Design a protein around this ligand. Structure first.
Ligand code: ARG
Lengths: 471, 463
């Protein structure tokens, strides 16, 4: 038969000049191909474009914010204390927020300015040490904490209209005191009520920036016109200004489009704060069929979205009878409102909504997950293109991460999403068929790449299409 | 022209360590954290997965000193079980276990050698593939020229990555014991003690310790295969277990579970967080790791195929050896060609779904083979016989590890069974029938091509 040649042949018939020349040629062709693979690697590495620089955002960009307008009305009676709330930080981090705003915890009775200070914890809420433990547990669970320093939060006038200089001193020393304590920011409300607003607010900004650069100062005004916004936001540029600039909307697609685009063009695509008021809920200005629509926009606009307590479930202040409008009670379970029990439904509490994917709290959780983990939403650029009569359509694209497109039906009839852009940069090439992460109305399956031409938008339906880096 | 035993104790420790500590601890120590969601219980699951992998490594020390034959899952299956399942192991390690393993390790090398130039976006796929193919070709040439060159490459680069992990552990312990001790204050909170999570915790704590037997694939080339193999495994296992536990101590001291669980390159995130300057040290470290952990899947697989060609399953060609330098050239070229072929596929990272039931099935079946030997033939010359406790508990652990990818990933694992089974045609058609009964034309062309590549590859059959 046959067998592998003995070494003898490997010494005579292989060592012949022809075979050894062929072997040398094979080896040298191999090393030519290998220097070629290296040349290809090193040249294609300088062919693909460079990678844009991350703006190294603070904490208050890495997720939404969240307000506790009143500690007691959040969890309920009896446990309306900081130590009691310390348990709810397992719930809040399920919403995937990167912020929190406790209500004014300083002792305040009424107009009397000589006794109301900004340093003493109101003992009916707790003490200092339980507060520090709350802060430490929050910090441990990656949730920075803010604090509200509106002095006269029990009374019509919030800034103690009688005097303005000594209240500025209380704010002054309270900032540094609570910052040494471990708070990660501050907010004030009704700055239009405080005379010498711009200058005092700039001074407090300088204080909180001089203590650290990862601290926050959020001023809230009841204003609704962009002119007041700019006139107060000239000397201060690191100041998330939450105002009623949006809430005055008549929910018209063209109206809200012009409004958001004009706010951004006026601030030149800076970093803003998107909310409907300083401490009011969403439902205090929006119908219940409109809420999913808004909460799809607020979690995608280029800024920090700021929700009050209870707007992750659609909590209404007028559905439950005998409820104080300014500070409603959160609906944990059927026993959340022991008064007139039985009317508390199952789809109206956080518990019954936590399991349903076609609920509103599921929308909130999925959105705030797509916000606090995806690059192109965290700090990506924002560009809106025109659409049908009453739509709202834009794109969020950072460099090469998952590029998002959002479109919103601000109408009560079936609309058509034309989606003609013709103006976005080449880094924003629209795919003819785009994915779909979720929709404000159940009925369209997620994971189905849908073509970007035939779209019929039912009344109040939102779209969060996605696509990867295209060229 | 025998394979010229030229591996010391340090080189064996370097192979094992170099084969275990790869990109499995730098880019994703999350498989445990994602299913445990706490620090204390995650460290306990790491320690216990390490203990089970140590029991398995002691099982293989006993085996690799009983049989003393290369392959460690193709000879141990071979003896006491027969040709069939042996060839099945060799087939699945020729198709979708060793080619995919080396291709993925080289692709990760490419990804993390250029990552400091492409931090925030996706490196160009072309560069990834070309540089990974170039790395594989360079390592195959190194391991061809002189086995000592392969041992030196492996030793140098496992030194490099162990130094890098020492740097990580030292920075973590400095930050811990300096003034902070910040996350290790109320550990074990929020954890999940329901088996539906601890199961996957351990099962992904075991895929991080895979590779503790690379030294048993080359048992024949070891200096003293009766003392250097078990001593080498016993010097490796504590080093790898301690480095895993302490590296995760470092991570969890500096970073937070959430970010860790989010970091696709957990070690890169750690570098950015703590290494203020020199943030390009950890990408270099992961690159050197994937290199020195590729030369452990080419210095250990191309000996598997060698034993394959020696027993008669694969053509006698893969059994040849270069006359003047004593390195199994044709097996090395076969493995390089397999890896380069499996580089053409886009997204080979998904092929970790087709052998995660085959690899551990075959490790467990080698353990069952050891138990079969212990029962049937208790009179073998055994230079060490550990208590049957070790093989039996590691067999139970491997039953766990092969049932977990059968509950989930069932369609994938069954396609993996299809892949492994696809060899049985070649077996019952070309292997089982003896010589002088196989067709004359195919054997004649195999003779001609063997003569060709043997004259070209400059190699000869073992003597
Ligand atoms: N011969 C081998 N077992 N090679 C596989 C090495 C992979 C090893 N489990 C790792 O962590 O990367």
């Amino acid at each position: 038969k046959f067998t592998g040649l003995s070494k003898e042949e490997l010494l005579k018939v292989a060592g012949s000049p022809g075979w050894v020349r062929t072997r040398w040629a094979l080896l040298l062709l191999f090393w030519l191909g290998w220097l070629g693979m290296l040349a290809g690697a090193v040249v294609i590495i300088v062919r693909a474009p460079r990678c844009r620089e991350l703006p190294a955002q603070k904490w208050w960009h890495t997720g939404a914010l969240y307000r506790i307008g009143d500690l007691q009305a959040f969890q309920g009676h009896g446990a309306g204390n900081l130590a009691g709330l310390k348990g709810r930080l397992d719930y809040l981090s399920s919403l995937k927020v990167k912020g929190l705003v406790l209500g004014p915890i300083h002792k305040n009775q009424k107009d009397d300015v000589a006794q109301t200070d900004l340093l003493q914890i109101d003992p009916n809420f707790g003490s200092k040490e339980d507060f520090d433990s709350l802060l430490q547990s929050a910090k441990k669970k990656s949730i920075r904490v803010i604090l509200d320093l509106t002095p006269n939060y029990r009374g019509e006038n919030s800034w103690f209209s009688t005097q303005v200089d000594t209240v500025a001193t209380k704010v002054k020393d309270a900032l540094e005191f609570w910052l040494q304590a471990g708070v990660d920011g501050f907010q004030v409300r009704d700055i239009e009520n405080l005379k010498d607003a711009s200058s005092f607010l700039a001074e407090w900004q300088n204080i909180t920036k001089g203590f650290s650069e990862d601290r926050l100062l959020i001023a809230g005004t009841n204003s609704s016109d962009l002119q007041q916004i700019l006139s107060l936001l000239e000397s201060n540029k690191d100041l998330l200004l939450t105002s009623s600039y949006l809430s005055d909307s008549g929910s018209t697609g063209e109206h809200t489009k012009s409004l958001v685009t004009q706010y951004l063009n006026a601030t030149g695509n800076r970093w803003c704060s998107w909310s409907l008021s300083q401490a009011r809920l969403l439902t205090s200005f929006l119908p219940a069929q409109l809420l999913r629509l808004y909460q799809l926009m607020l979690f995608t606009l280029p800024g920090t979205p700021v929700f009050s307590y209870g707007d992750e479930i659609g909590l209404d202040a007028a559905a439950l009878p005998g409820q104080p409008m300014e500070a409603p009670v959160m609906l944990w379970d059927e026993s959340s409102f022991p008064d007139i029990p039985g009317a508390v439904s199952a789809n109206m509490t956080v518990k019954g909504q936590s399991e349903d994917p076609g609920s509103l709290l599921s929308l909130f959780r999925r959105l705030s997950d797509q916000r606090s983990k995806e690059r192109s939403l965290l700090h990506g650029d924002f560009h809106a293109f025109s659409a049908g009569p009453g739509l709202f359509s834009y794109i969020r694209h950072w460099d090469q991460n998952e590029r998002f497109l959002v479109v919103l039906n601000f109408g009560d009839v079936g609309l058509s999403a034309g989606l003609q852009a013709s103006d976005l940069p080449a880094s924003a090439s629209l795919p003819a068929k785009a994915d779909l992460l979720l929709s404000t109305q159940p009925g369209r399956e997620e994971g189905s790449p849908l073509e970007l031409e035939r779209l019929k938008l039912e009344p109040h339906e939102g779209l969060l299409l996605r696509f990867p880096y295209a060229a | 022209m025998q394979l010229k035993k030229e591996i010391s104790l340090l080189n064996g420790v370097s192979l094992v360590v170099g084969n275990m500590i790869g990109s499995g601890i730098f880019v994703s120590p999350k498989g445990v954290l994602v299913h445990t969601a706490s620090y204390g219980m995650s460290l306990i699951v790491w320690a216990i997965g390490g203990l089970f992998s140590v029991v398995g490594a002691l099982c293989y020390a006993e085996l690799g000193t009983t049989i003393t034959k290369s392959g460690a899952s193709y000879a141990y299956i071979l003896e006491a079980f027969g040709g069939f399942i042996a060839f099945i192991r060799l087939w699945v390690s020729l198709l979708v276990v060793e080619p995919t393993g080396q291709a993925i390790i080289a692709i990760t090398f490419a990804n993390y050698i250029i990552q400091p130039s492409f931090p925030s976006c996706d490196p160009p796929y072309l560069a990834c593939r070309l540089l990974a193919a170039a790395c594989i070709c360079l390592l195959t040439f190194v391991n061809c020229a002189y086995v000592k060159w392969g041992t030196r490459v492996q030793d140098t680069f496992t030194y490099a990555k162990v130094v890098a992990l020492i740097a990580i552990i030292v920075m973590g312990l400095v930050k811990l014991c300096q003034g902070h001790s910040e996350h290790f204050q109320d550990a074990f909170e929020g954890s999940s003690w329901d088996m539906g999570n601890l199961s996957l915790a351990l099962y992904s704590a075991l895929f991080s310790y895979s590779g503790w037997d690379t030294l048993n694939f080359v048992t024949e080339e070891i200096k003293n295969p009766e003392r250097n193999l078990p001593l080498a495994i016993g010097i490796s296992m504590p080093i790898v277990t301690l480095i895993y536990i302490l590296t995760n101590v470092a991570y969890y001291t500096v970073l937070n579970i959430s970010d860790v669980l989010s970091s696709d390159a957990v070690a890169v995130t750690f570098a950015d967080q703590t290494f203020g300057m020199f943030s390009w040290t950890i990408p270099i470290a992961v690159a050197l790791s994937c290199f020195g952990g590729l030369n452990a899947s080419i210095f250990a697989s191309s000996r598997l195929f060698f034993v394959g060609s020696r027993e008669g399953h694969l053509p006698d060609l893969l059994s040849m050896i270069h006359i003047e330098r004593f390195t199994p050239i044709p097996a090395l070229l076969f493995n390089c060609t397999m890896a380069l072929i499996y580089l053409i596929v886009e997204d080979v990272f998904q092929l970790i779904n087709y052998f995660s039931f085959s690899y551990w099935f075959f490790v467990g079946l080698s353990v069952v083979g050891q138990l079969y030997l212990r029962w049937k033939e208790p009179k073998r010359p055994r230079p060490l016989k550990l208590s049957v406790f070790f093989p039996i508990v590691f067999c139970i652990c491997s039953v766990f590890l092969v049932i977990v990818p059968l509950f989930t990933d069932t369609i994938n694992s069954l396609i993996g069974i299809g892949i492994a089974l696809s060899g049985v045609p070649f077996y019952f058609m070309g292997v089982y029938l003896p010589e002088s009964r196989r067709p004359l034309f195919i054997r004649n062309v195999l003779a001609a091509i063997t003569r060709g590549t043997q004259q070209l590859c400059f190699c000869v059959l073992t003597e």
